[PDB]
From Swiss-Prot, chain B:
Residue numbers binding L-arginine: Q171, W280, Y281, E285
Entry's localization field: Cell membrane, Sarcolemma; Cell projection, Dendritic spine
Shown segment, full-protein numbering: 299 to 718 of 1429
Consequence of changing Y281S: 30% decrease of nitric-oxide synthase activity
Free-text comment on this protein's domains from its UniProt entry: The PDZ domain participates in protein-protein interaction, and is responsible for targeting nNos to synaptic membranes. Mediates interaction with VAC14.
The protein's name: Nitric oxide synthase 1
Post-translational modification: Ubiquitinated; mediated by STUB1/CHIP in the presence of Hsp70 and Hsp40 (in vitro).
Function: Produces nitric oxide (NO) which is a messenger molecule with diverse functions throughout the body. In the brain and peripheral nervous system, NO displays many properties of a neurotransmitter. Inhibitory transmitter for non-adrenergic and non-cholinergic nerves in the colorectum. Probably has nitrosylase activity and mediates cysteine S-nitrosylation of cytoplasmic target proteins such SRR. Inhibitory transmitter for non-adrenergic and non-cholinergic nerves in the colorectum.
Phenotype for Y281H: 50% decrease of nitric-oxide synthase activity
Annotated binding of heme b, by residue: C108, Y399
Positions that bind (6R)-L-erythro-5,6,7,8-tetrahydrobiopterin: S36, V370, W371, F384
Tissue expression notes: Isoform N-NOS-1 is expressed in brain and colorectum. Found in the Auerbach's plexus of the enteric nervous system. Isoform PNNOS is expressed in the penis, urethra, prostate, and skeletal muscle, and coexists with the cerebellar nnos in the pelvic plexus, bladder and liver, and is detectable in the cerebellum.
Complex and partners: Homodimer. Interacts with DLG4 (via N-terminal tandem pair of PDZ domains); the interaction possibly being prevented by the association between NOS1 and CAPON. Forms a ternary complex with CAPON and RASD1. Forms a ternary complex with CAPON and SYN1. Interacts with ZDHHC23. Interacts with NOSIP; which may impair its synaptic location. Interacts with HTR4. Interacts with SLC6A4. Interacts with VAC14.
């Protein structure tokens, strides 16, 4: 019932009871652990709304008050009638902040309560979505002093009137398959880069071409939009020691903004809720730049460094990996663009876990995602036991629209 | 029920059916995942069924399931059990059992080598001196002058739980750790408690930074006894860096033979409480964990200073930088001295091939992602991108309480 998690580097032991309020399943069973798998009605709705309202009023110290009972009734009535409901702005903001608070795969949750929520529920068209998204981008970028934000479009109704941002992130680079069979630009976005063209986009066919937004409002077909360049902060990548580094022709965008997730609050589903915070260095330097299936630039960098690439045991890949990541962080800091290294971010998360354990009785955390893709054990989270479980409100994965849209 | 795991780097999908044979519990529930939790006498009543499941697996493995030899064996054991409340494995069953416990060890990335395990049968051992002798032969055989050979030595199984054989050391070879009165620690901090028990038992500590600990051996539930492994039998490797001539001056060295000796081997219900085994090191075990964990030798800073790295702010990634060099040094020193070792890139690539083979020939491969992925450069190794299924199959290697916490001293 009362589970304990131990940190093997500091012997600190925390007790978790928050998991007892868990509602969704994990993918695992007592016979099998799937911890490393990437993707494990009015009658249905009211109980959800109730659970949410109870936690909402409880958080404001008005659990079971008249206001609570009242709102509970009002929502109850609304559901019975309309077969759904609308959150009060206060609930919208609380729900979003908590969905972030509950994202077990996010190492940056110590920032959870500072989220700026943009209510775009009155939106009706793709141009309207583009407008809201541009405002989000400018607000969050804040000339390099990034501020976390989320813009929430209209909730789901009949499932045939869904708003969806087709991009996986608001800002990403295009990827095109060349005759060579090789891939130019970002390989992860090869397909999307195609669906944009299958729509009319005029690809400059470059290595770092900011993709166009493909916005879907109310179910209708999506529409393309070029984000005003001055709104897309980019960072030229240079090494604080290797002048030749810049010759690599590397740069990345400063704003990470997940746009393909679904937000669940009190049973209500928000299929278009792009959100953004700021990068942890390794996301770019380790994953985007060195993944074998991404920009895969390890060899090139190792060559320039003139390292013995004959035997894996010389650890040239490891050597290069480090330099590359030193560069990413150096560049961002130099341009005064917010960014955080894995040491600092993970140190933050441990503090955050401790705060959540004392103030909330726990903190759902997914070790597989929390530990950085490089230098795992020299970061504190590696030695930290974590309990993973699903709490709502939450952020969930959802099918790429191009695999569900009825044109 | 079928289950698939996908490798997101190659899109190779695999199907697991072997998990269906999984009987033991994982620690997780439908509502919670304990995937990152370090540590999540039998009755006749429960024994024979465990015996049967095992003998069935064994006879199927040799293509004799349902034969007369199979049936007679099941009858022979059934009888022995009701007759003696236990039973003895045939040599062939023991060898098979030991190999499969390794094969089934979900946290082991070196399982591609599982079928080559050399098994030493020490079930006739009765005293600690006998244990010492067996352990010495295992170490010399396994070490093989630097060309390491995997091996396991199996002492008598548990009976009533009051006559257990145990190796109190956590590994056959490990360095002493000494807590100084000023609060600092000399040697390996991980071994401070065990070292104190050794000194108390009478060991004369040389008190250096790399003193090979003595063996503290327990036979038939008796009080443990001390023994010094012959120095000529302990292969050690001085660590130096191929480019940094000052590295050698850090005075670092490590032993070549990694030999877990505190685990419990379960086979067909029988419990082997003393079953030391060895293979060879993956570089990062020493370079990352032994040398760089904050709670171990913790040398990042000193190596950082010597390299003249900007240590003012973490974002310089000075720790990351020093880490790589230290690991380059460990691999380099071992290769130079021709002492077997494997780097994490090579070891992980091998585990992926092994894993694919296991799915195709066995229907699955239980694997613990948290442990399989190396403690450094995680995503640039293929296992990072590989989905895995973790489940417990027997035969198996299990954790057991440290003996100093359960032993009834006879004095
Ligand atoms: C302010 C700084 C923030 C930092 C440093 C941070 C860092 C991270 C990192 C490293 C990951 C894993 C990324 C990957 O490997 O692809 C992640 C995942 C995630 N974060 Fe955060 N995050 C921040 C803000 C946010 C915000 C504002 C939200 C939403 C309100 C959020 C929600 C999540 C979710 C749901 C995931 C997992 C997404 C998935 O499964 O792909 N994060 N975060
Ligand atoms: C042939 C060389 C081998 C290599 C390269 C290898 C490598 C490893 C590594 C890197 C780990 C994790 C160690 C740690 O992080 O502390 C491990 C764990 C494990 N290995 Fe292997 N291994 C090998 C041979 C063996 C042998 C011979 C056995 C048994 C017969 C075995 C049984 C296990 C077990 C049971 C674990 C888990 C230990 C625990 O949970 O504490 N390994 N191995
Ligand atoms: N810092 C953040 N990172 C999440 C988005 C970027 C990620 N590298 C892409 N990604 O999840 C790739 C798909 N597996 N979030 N945020 O600050 O809002
Ligand atoms: N290569 C092997 N490694 C396992 C034993 C060494 C480990 N670093 C010590 N250890 O797990 C200390 C406590 N967590 N095995 N083997 O070759 O048989
Ligand atoms: C197969 C495995 O689940 C997959 O590679 C995971 C591992 N850990 C991760 N951790 C983070 N933060 N992000 C990822 O994309 C992944 N990928
Ligand atoms: C808390 C966490 O589970 C623990 O530190 C684990 C993580 N992964 C590991 N992986 C290996 N190979 N060895 C370890 O000791 C650990 N420690
Ligand atoms: Zn699990």
């Amino acid at each position: 019932r009362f589970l304990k998690v131990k940190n093997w580097e500091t012997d600190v032991v925390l007790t978790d009871t928050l998991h007892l309020k868990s509602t969704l399943e994990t993918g695992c069973t007592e016979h099998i652990c799937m911890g490393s798998i990437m993707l494990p009605t009015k009658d249905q709705l009211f109980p959800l709304a109730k659970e949410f309202l109870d936690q909402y009023y409880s958080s404001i110290k008005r659990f079971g008050s008249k206001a609570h009972m009242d709102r509970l009734e009002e929502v109850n009535k609304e559901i019975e009638s309309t077969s759904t409901y609308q959150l009060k702005d206060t609930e919208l903001i609380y729900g979003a902040k908590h969905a972030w608070r509950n994202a077990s795969r996010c190492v940056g949750r110590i920032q959870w309560s500072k989220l700026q929520v943009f209510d775009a529920r009155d939106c009706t068209t793709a141009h309207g979505m583009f407008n809201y998204i541009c405002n989000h981008v400018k607000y969050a970028t804040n000339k390099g002093n990034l501020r976390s934000a989320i813009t929430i479009f209209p909730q789901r109704t009949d499932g045939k009137h869904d708003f969806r941002v087709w991009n996986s992130q608001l800002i990403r680079y295009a990827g095109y398959k060349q005759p060579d069979g090789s891939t130019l630009g970002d390989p992860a976005n090869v397909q999307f880069t195609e669906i944009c063209i299958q729509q009319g986009w005029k690809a400059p066919r470059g290595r770092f071409d900011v993709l166009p937004l493909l916005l879907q409002a109310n179910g209708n077909d999506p529409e393309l939009f070029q984000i005003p360049p001055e709104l897309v902060l980019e960072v030229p990548i240079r090494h604080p020691k290797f002048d030749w580094f810049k010759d690599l022709g590397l740069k990345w965008y400063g704003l990470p903004a997940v746009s393909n997730m679904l937000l669940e609050i009190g049973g209500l589903e928000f299929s278009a809720c792009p959100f953004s915070g700021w990068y942890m260095g390794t996301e770019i330097g380790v994953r985007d730049y060195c993944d074998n299936s991404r920009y895969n630039i390890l060899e090139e960098v190792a060559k320039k460094m003139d390292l013995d690439m004959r035997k894996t045991s010389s650890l040239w890949k490891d050597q290069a990996l480090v330099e590359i990541n030193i560069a990413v962080l150096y560049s961002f800091q130099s341009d005064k663009v917010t960014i955080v290294d894995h040491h600092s971010a993970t140190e933050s998360f441990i503090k955050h876990m401790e705060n959540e354990y004392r103030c909330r009785g726990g903190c759902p955390a997914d070790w597989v995602w929390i530990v950085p893709p490089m230098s795992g054990s020299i970061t504190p989270v590696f030695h930290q036991e974590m309990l993973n479980y699903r709490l709502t409100p939450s952020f969930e994965y959802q099918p790429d629209p191009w695999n569900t849209h009825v044109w």
